[PDB]
């Protein structure tokens, strides 16, 4: 039958910025999670609440695949119960997370001579995010009591900021492509199963 189109997610050309991260629903297919572990060399493949060796034996209502790009020293924030700019302001996993996160170094794809300034993250925000929330706002962040009126200045700062992804950067500061697999088990029929 139909194979789950993991090539479209993992092998995409353009990846979303972390603040405007990207969800892809997966349904009506059979996934070979064993092959996914050995499909390549991933620098990270932490599973949560499931063993990927025995994930091929379960069925789920639907599977959500979230993908984006972050720094190397921020991949550790893509885990339950984390803190930091990426976890608090960009992409937040729940404490009861039941899925695997996956990452690999993408200096070959997402860094540029003189600086790649197309990859952005959220710097300022009024509050931390709820799990799986996504804020793509762009309004000037009011830090004082004076209203900003859509104009940058003192105490009026633009909410987003860009990685200066350079090829000669250290691997901690290099771009990494994260892909998070969420598994949902509801009262409905299950359309995504192993072999």
């Amino acid at each position, epitope marked *: 039958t139909n194979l789950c189109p993991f090539g479209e997610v993992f092998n995409a050309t353009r990846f979303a910025s972390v603040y405007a991260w990207n969800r892809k629903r997966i349904s009506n297919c059979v996934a070979d999670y064993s092959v996914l572990y050995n499909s390549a060399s991933f620098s990270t493949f932490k599973c949560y609440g499931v063993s990927p060796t025995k994930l091929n034996d379960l069925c789920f209502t639907n599977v959500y695949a979230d993908s984006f790009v972050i720094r190397g020293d921020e991949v550790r924030q893509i885990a339950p119960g984390q803190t930091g700019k990426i976890a608090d302001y960009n992409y937040k996993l729940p404490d009861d997370f039941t899925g695997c996160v996956i990452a690999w170094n993408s200096n070959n794809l997402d860094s540029k001579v003189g600086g790649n300034y197309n990859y952005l993250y959220r*710097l300022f925000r009024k509050s931390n995010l709820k799990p799986f929330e996504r804020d793509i706002s762009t309004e000037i962040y009011q*830090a*004082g*009591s*004076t209203p900003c009126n859509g104009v940058e*200045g*003192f*105490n009026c*700062y633009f909410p987003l900021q860009s990685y200066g992804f350079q090829p000669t950067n250290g691997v901690g500061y290099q771009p990494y492509r994260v892909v998070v697999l969420s598994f949902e088990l509801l009262h409905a029929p299950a359309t995504v199963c192993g072999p």
Partner: antibody
Amino acid sequence: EVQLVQSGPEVKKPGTSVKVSCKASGFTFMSSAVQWVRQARGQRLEWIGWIVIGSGNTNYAQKFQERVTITRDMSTSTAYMELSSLRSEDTAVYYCAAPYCSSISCNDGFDIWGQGTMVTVSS
Amino acid sequence: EIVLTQSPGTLSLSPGERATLSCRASQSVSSSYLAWYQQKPGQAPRLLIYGASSRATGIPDRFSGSGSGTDFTLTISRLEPEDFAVYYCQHYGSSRGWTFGQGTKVEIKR
């Protein structure tokens, strides 16, 4: 108790640089911003530039846009300003200033000021 | 960039009199980003007025800021002895181009 503490007095030779520090203690530094000001002996206030601690985004006066840098270390709650190619007309007293911030929001004026850093540039 | 001009250069007033200090901008600027500072010799500047008309924390009532557009005024109603100093206005609108005035000295008359 809520303050900015700058470096000690500097004596400098023409052509060299100088890096003054500004360590903040007592308030939420990561949401604040630091501006830099100088003033020669018995003269007016000269604006140098300013940085946004959260972003590090800087903006210098046109007078110094080439030979000045403003930087911040969040882990030490410190702003630095570096003036290149010191001339005699750079002999002045240098000031950092910031608004008090809390866990909630910031003030709408540079109300915190450092002690002032004397910088004598001479041969 | 924008230029601020303070009037006059020196005020010669006795204690208890009324000081009117003017700060005129070369272009129209927003009231949200005009401040006043006080400065005694050897000390750092001290914020009296921010947002053109608001007093900073702990400033006596006798300090009062007014203005809009290009004409801004700082008024000291009854001059205390601890009020004779040099006063500067500062505009800090936009992320760039901030400036100070040449400053007005206020001195005791005798």
